[model samples]
Target: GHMDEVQNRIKEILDKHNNGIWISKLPHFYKEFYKEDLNQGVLQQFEHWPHICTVEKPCGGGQDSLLYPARREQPLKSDQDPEKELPPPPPAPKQEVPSQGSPAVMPDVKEKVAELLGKYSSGLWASALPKAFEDMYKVKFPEDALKNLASLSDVCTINYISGNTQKAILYAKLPLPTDK
Candidate 1:
């Protein structure tokens, strides 16, 4: 089949999802939405498609790349602020401190992991969490941190990519109603 047909079909698929799909999940979507099985050659073509925009969840994680359709340019004005239509402010500059004290006073690994993962609004690649933790605290992330975090409340795991080696995508769910 020609790429023109694939491009058209992909746009159709993109319309159904708000955030778009991961590159690894495209085959499943193609099969389910268009009833066609895609080959490796056909799969790679989307990377070059003009309408497709490649997005990565984390700065260093290539495995967490996603494909999104080119969105129409939004007007310069934003609806975020009522008095003014300004874009959000930039994040505070990070300090360059050296040396961290020993981990004697560190909190439970599960709580630490939950707190860090919750900071990302969309979600974070599970594999990337450890490196982030290490960077922030300058200490090795507990090997069992994620294993224990699997039971944390309000932390949901999403499987965007298929296969046994795929890492979990961790999202902090909205708080549940509390007992009065």
Candidate 2:
């Protein structure tokens, strides 16, 4: 019963000065209000008491809980650096080779085709080469000439009827001469 009343008295004073007060003032303040000297045994309870903490005096020797930070108010050590600097990975060299052609002696495939196509405006079938074609041009029809002819804007190639058989025809684009 006596210890409970003594603890209550200390708590009441602590409540009034919630921030905390000097432990040295406990003796005088306790005597002033209770008209009795504070038991020295009760002073030790500040160490075990919740929210109570002791801070050292800035200017001199003795310590006190005068302006000590509460256990609850103290920050936790949770601020760790999650993103540390790591060396950047080098990029890969995605290589590509350009297409080139060989500078070799070749037959005049375009000239031969042009000479033959110029004779007929209706165009000539690719599959049906004239008997005199090899004798006149002195060169066999190049297999890749039709594909290369695509680069010439004036030359048009399409599939059409050649002697009741479907065949590819190469024709030169020419405007019709109209009688004005």
Candidate 3:
């Protein structure tokens, strides 16, 4: 049956090319037309072809797994530069003054407060504050600031100042709203 269907389809293609002259060369040419169904004839004809001994299974994994194995010992391409120069350090804080001293006279308290504020603010600060406070203290807040701030009676006030400085720095770094 199958052979009959295949033969018929092949006949159709050959007929289009050369008026079906090659149809007799197809396998199972002797099957009785009266008794043959398309499916049975095709299967019987297929039995005469060479058998497939092996088949490769597709590897199942993500895109990384489908890549071909790399050569282990190939030499790397040279990386010499025709025109190269060392990259400059990141633009220094854009603000005019990098840091500022606390208005209060106590060195220890000022240091502690500045340090604590710097740590808490981290990278995200708000706008509308003095850039001096923010730019100068971008580095990690010192541990001593936390200890000292906790003990002070006016800790809240100090935190507010530190918060303001952090905000100012962030604002200065950001481009203008119009630019965005």
For each candidate, what TM-score against the reference?
0.35, 0.31, 0.15
Better of 1 and 3 by TM-score: 1
Task: Please give the distance, in angstroms, between residue 95's alpha carbon in candidate 3 and its true position after superposition.
Answer: 34
The parts of candidate 2 lying over 4 Å away from their true place are: 51-180
Output candidate 3 Cα RMSD: 20.9
Between prediction 1 and prediction 2, the one with superior lDDT is 1
- Residue 163 lDDT in candidate 2: 48
Worst 10 residues of 3 by lDDT: 64-73
Off by over 4 Å in 1: 53-62, 72-180
Q: Rate the local accuracy (lDDT) of all candidates.
A: 0.61, 0.53, 0.34
Q: Candidate 2's residue-wise lDDT over 87-149, tens digit each?
A: 344332342333334533223554555566677666765544343346566666555654443
TM-score of 2: 0.31
Clashes of each: 0, 0, 12
Better of 2 and 3 by TM-score: 2
Model 3 Cα lDDT, one tens digit per residue, 57-118? 23543221111112211234335443355444444546556555544433554454444444
